[PDB]
Symmetry: D3
Subunit: 237 residues, 6 copies
């Protein structure tokens, strides 16, 4: 057990899908995994382990923000033998050509957090995904007929940012999505020698207020999860 | 409704107790509040509103880390008329004379987050509690026979810090407890014109590994909550 | 003696009031202290020791700015046995509802100096007063019928700042007064294990640009000093 | 012409390979290009344009360091219609299992420069390559039987760094190679809307301090260049 | 009159010698100037104006630290027509071959203050003296047969520095003397369009622990004053 | 030999003039030196050694930017007994009263590079030239009847700067010329225990948009070289 995960070595697979919302974790388990067992309830951060076409897979919430997800991802790498983390989340878009419900794959993750500076002697750590995991995700998306853009995310510490102008800077430098975790997860993976990827669906445009249905959200969310799970099977080869 | 709180103006009291763990929120509601109703379930971040000796009070989890609690505290101040936030949490100690299960009141909160620098043109914002709320909490503790130390907390972004030496610096400058939120909450309160306090119990010494029972944890936790609730009644006068 | 104080152990009381202006220290001593003898003249930084209602009290100037007051407060603490320092100064106001001749108590002090960053591994140290001294000061003010505002000061390095935009930011985040020392003194008090408090009167509105009459302002200055002296008597119990 | 390139629109291909050494650009041109004409000599920064298997390709030196290569890459992008830049350089190795003559592809590039902080409001910009170009390069290397490592480079300002401790930190966080340009080039490519990639061969071990034979090292250098040229042919489809 | 100088345009000469200690200003006026007339006593920061070999010369203390001297030097320049400031102070040595009583001329001044960073968009401003004034000072020193070093000072905010290692770094980079003002005066000079020079006398050695001794303070102090005053005369011609 | 200079101890004189352009080094060797002998061609960074009025003098390009010139200047100092570096370059003007073809002497150099911050524990290092060398240069300029300004340069990392406002700040603070090297050369000089000076010729105006024109480049360029060379002679005597 660790302070935030009441479980032992072997309860988690070597690969873990992590939505922000732990309710979405329970939904992943019942919708995609066979023979699923609950492996964590500490703080209501529900975690499960089952199989997807024979492959052992886990899914657990990480919570909003770099500090929350850094706790869970670290404990998984160092205490539960986890080799790969796939964040499966939502993000807001700043580019007019990036559309609602697009799948975005974060090869890199910008941030305004200080966590990587603390790690990297106050220099610029390029918070990057594992390259094979990125390609695996792109190829799985192609096989599912989903076109996916690959590029930079921005991991914000403040959802309610007092710096509105920063969104224009993000746009100028090609940021595909604004979320709150990738740069933290990528930092942890590098620190403790594991691999990570963040995939997000665009749920918001910080531009116009445009609408989606609940049905449209479920279908797009299911597509991201399919992408992530099929990406794992490609990574196994 | 707000993106993280499915509720309307009036569902929350003007004062909100916030543990990190949403399971502890449900426990506060059933143990201390009368006539309690559920007011939030979004992302399993359970929130309740009831009364404590006639006084309308709310309790809801905020999640681990500055970014999580900044979401909820902001939305409460700006969309639900919340005037006071009391964080009710745990912390780790670095001072040998600060003992396990001590009640610590954060008049101020140091941090290694960058959130207040983003707010404060990269200068030093002294993240402080509302003074009356601090005194209210000290006086409530005295009336309950609990001695409480008042001073600085340290709100860490990394629970698993790669900078071990920083704990000695904290100790040298008198930091009473290490937690992950106060400086973020104090920042939000100042930004949006409300009041905040963080009270923590010492659950850990980053020094020796010393033990407590589950019974000892419940009693100390109940004492912190009593302190916080009685502090509100003193603040009403 | 120390490099800036030609005096000996015992020559100061264990509490020292500190205006910025040494001529103001002489003013405090002659007006409020009995049997007052001068105990320092090095660099014209006049220090005095006498009694207030039978309690031994010292008063001494600290000069303008964090670097000047850091020198004096340090030497008093480590070489002259001083346990409490009460800065008694002036500040400019930034909030419209903060009026001329309001008494302001700095529970915290923001700053643009980097002294506390030097001390605190480049993180945010929340420069705070000792809580008991704050409370003693508030109660002493209550007993004299004076309505003390407790909150954040801002300790500036540049009285003539090139960046006028920073005053709006101070206003936004609730800064009660702008002065030049508090954050420095609080850093010293935490570094060397003593206690400190800054009281200020508002002598300036960096908003409306106005006065106020000489007799009324000098009355309020005397009230601040009475609050300081009476607060130490409350601290003795 | 631009201030550092005496040539005209059309004189360069829409892809430019860029070694640091202009004499190396002449080497690339004569060895791998047919019908190669020199298109720039200003400051001795030799640029050439020819064909590789019927595809128009240019090659030109960029000089040592982020500031030098930022100038050339910018001018190519905004004035000579260049859409892709492939840096083909050398790096020093930091990881023990990264060997001499390994081909390294910088999906990302860390840095100690502050150029990207100037661009990105002092936050962390993740300096990344274009994903497709990375994949093209990996596939081209696979087709030639070469085992390319994909990950982080570190773009240093000081070849002779005063801070030897930073090399351990690079090792800890998985940096594959240390060079002087990639982060600069990736910043330019994002600023001005083009695409970039850095390939390096490991010519140095800042760990074991060793060689390796002249024929074998020049063989591996030629393989890097073949990978670069073949990757652009894959990019055309 | 200005907020810290009770005097009128004309009361000061167009060059002002400024020691930190106002009692040294007094001493200088008495010992070196004819017809010496006190032009300021606000805050005991004594200012004088008299004559040196017929040349109108002023001398006023500036207090300890960048914030103190930045106030006075500014007010002199904007409201009293002062064109040249010459700081005449003391410093601590860090180089072993710089010995006690040596005269150092601050061609530049390093600092750990944030003031120049505030002025210069967080970039490195090279805080420099006026060249002609430096040359004037060197020629006056030669003419009086006094040895004089020219180079960098370091203007510290913390006399009692908690970072002992920093002195090794100053040593490494050739710092002739540690004082508390020059970098601020040179910043003010540039900001407000005047000229300045800091000359210092090496009091103690930061390493060795021994301060200015017997009558040797006075002659060495007088040598600096002589240089400064003679340097003004050369500047006129 | 060093990694970027293929030559032996003795091949270089103890002072080296360095333009950015290696073809200017060639031109200088041809036009000003007798018995001129090429001592380096590694990376086309041409180095020469000959005679000026019997004095052994070397001249070598350093490439564009702090990182490029930091490599060469270091290697010259540590492995070829070079005592003095004189950068002889071009700069852009920011002050309207600084006109095209003006000769500027870099007494100090501001910068937006992080290199000196890396060397100086993130504090402000005042990057200065050697005083005697500055004086030598001014006296040689007077003797040749050439006007010469003495003050601060600004060493930029981005020729194509995305921060246009910064030029206003340079203007405000008296920056005589914008170039890309001086602050790095002065840092290297201090780090490795040699002396340096940067002299520049004002090519364009950053505001006005017009570069060095017709034969006036050559005479103005030759005036700088003449000053530099004559300045060496004065330094010997
Ligand atoms: O995390 C986020 N930050 C900003 N905007 C957003 N939209 C969806 C997630 C999101
Ligand atoms: O939040 C925290 N960070 C570090 N140590 C701790 N102990 C308990 C909470 C805690
Ligand atoms: O620094 C300051 N800025 C404006 N007004 C003030 N009063 C006292 C200090 C002060
Ligand atoms: O900057 C660098 N440091 C060490 N080795 C290297 N090789 C290439 C650049 C480089
Ligand atoms: O200002 C100073 N800081 C440190 N040591 C010193 N000696 C003399 C002045 C001085
Ligand atoms: O280096 C430079 N940066 C900006 N403008 C310039 N003109 C000439 C050199 C120069």
């Amino acid at each position: 057990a660790t302070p935030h995960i009441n479980a032992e070595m072997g309860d988690f697979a070597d690969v873990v899908l992590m939505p922000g919302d732990p309710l979405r974790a329970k939904y992943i388990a019942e919708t995609f995994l066979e023979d699923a067992r609950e492996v964590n309830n500490v703080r209501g951060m529900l975690g499960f382990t089952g199989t997807y076409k024979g492959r052992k897979i886990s899914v657990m919430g990480h919570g909003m923000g770099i500090p929350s997800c850094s706790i869970y991802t670290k404990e998984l790498i160092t205490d539960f033998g986890v080799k790969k983390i796939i964040r499966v989340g939502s993000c807001g878009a700043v580019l007019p050509h990036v559309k609602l419900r697009d799948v975005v794959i974060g090869m890199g993750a910008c941030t305004d957090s200080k966590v990587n500076r603390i790690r990297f002697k106050d220099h610029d750590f390029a918070a990057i995904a594992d390259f094979d995991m990125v390609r695996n995700a792109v190829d799985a998306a192609k096989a599912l007929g989903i076109d996916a853009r690959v590029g930079n995310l921005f991991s914000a510490d403040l959802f309610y940012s007092p710096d509105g102008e920063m969104f224009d800077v993000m746009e100028k430098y090609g940021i595909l999505g604004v979320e709150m975790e990738a740069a933290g997860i990528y930092g942890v993976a590098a620190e403790f020698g594991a691999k990570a990827l963040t995939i997000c669906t665009v749920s918001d445009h910080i531009r116009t207020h445009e609408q989606t249905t609940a049905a449209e959200r479920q279908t797009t969310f299911n597509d991201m999860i399919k992408i992530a799970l099929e990406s794992v099977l490609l990574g196994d080869k």
